């Protein structure tokens, strides 16, 4: 019902129809009628709800045939379909569009829907498929008692007995999820499935979810945690993929907590997607995004300033041209009754970079990991709600221990560097 649509011709002023094995175009289009209702399916086949059959011709013997029929041509490219109909039917501006909205017929293609459990290793729903000589164009609950929506991963479940569960967008977390009662976070460890990162990213999105994000040390300890006793290597949605940026979370979460393996990450150019390993007791490694590994999903239900200080929104900001270590830079802020600058918004980053930093190369900012290594916090106890690393940053967490963060160049993105280094700094108080 969501991605089912009606084909329409302006040149012929009528929608496509199917009757038995013959195709007619009728000017009076009613969405109520299923014989006029179509949807895209696998193998570039076009599926009809009313007839529960596919459109095809012969290698101009056009009509409607069973999808299983291999000897005919049942394949259609949406981008040419409009042009083809005009040829085989004569719709002699004269273009073919979706009935409701003037959208191309490629507006709602068939998305591979990835399974979750079952003897099928996450393999996508084969649509259509045949159980007990009945054609299905989606997931059905018939053949179960628990009522859970399931589908097959082959042309014939009677012959192959290959099945899987269906993804369900929801705001509860039951049967398919474990729940952390401290944070209302629901996690899903798909040990058996084997999908790419891009494929896995999809399978999570399909469930009103996304790939894992470990934003706090508590999350890692909890997960460490649920992995206990098991053997696997799982995708986590830690990517290097933003060409113009460093590491980030697939859910645009702030990268404040790290748990890389000792000699990791190596090959940040070829291996752009991160994984969690049980063997390292929760440690992170980066691998090739093309490889097929299990994955983990995560979802959550439901001013007048001082004289030398320029203002932005709630707070006042000032530049210290004097060069110092990170720590001695923070002290000079205290002497001013403020702390090292803290950034919580992109707007705040632009101002600080455009108005305050100006044409100075590098600057210390409030971010560090001195309290606990690998866990970054702002100096003024502010929440880390924003992360804007430069490409392949951060990288100095295992080499320096006392790892501190700087703004670098015009763009305003960040490098991490030992607090050894002497640079200018920016202060912020209200």
Residue numbers in the entry: 40 to 98, 105 to 137, 155 to 364, 380 to 507
Share the article's original sentences.
The C-type mannose receptor and its homolog Endo180 (or uPARAP, for urokinase plasminogen activator receptor-associated protein) mediate the endocytic uptake of collagen by macrophages and fibroblasts. The large extracellular region of each of these receptors consists of an N-terminal ricin B-like domain, followed by a fibronectin type II (FN2) domain and eight (MR, Endo180, PLA2R) or ten (DEC-205) C-type lectin (CTL) domains. Here, we present the crystal and solution structures of domains 1–4 (D1-4) of Endo180 and a mutational analysis of collagen binding. The Endo180 D1-4 region adopts an L-shaped structure with a short arm (∼60 Å length) consisting of the ricin-like and FN2 domains, and a longer arm (∼80 Å length) consisting of the two CTL domains.
We obtained two crystal forms of the natively glycosylated D1-4 region, one of which diffracted to 2.5 Å resolution and allowed the structure to be determined. The overall structure of Endo180 D1-4 is the same in both crystal forms (the root-mean-square deviations [rmsd] between the four crystallographically independent copies range from 1.2 to 1.4 Å) and only the high-resolution structure is described in the following.
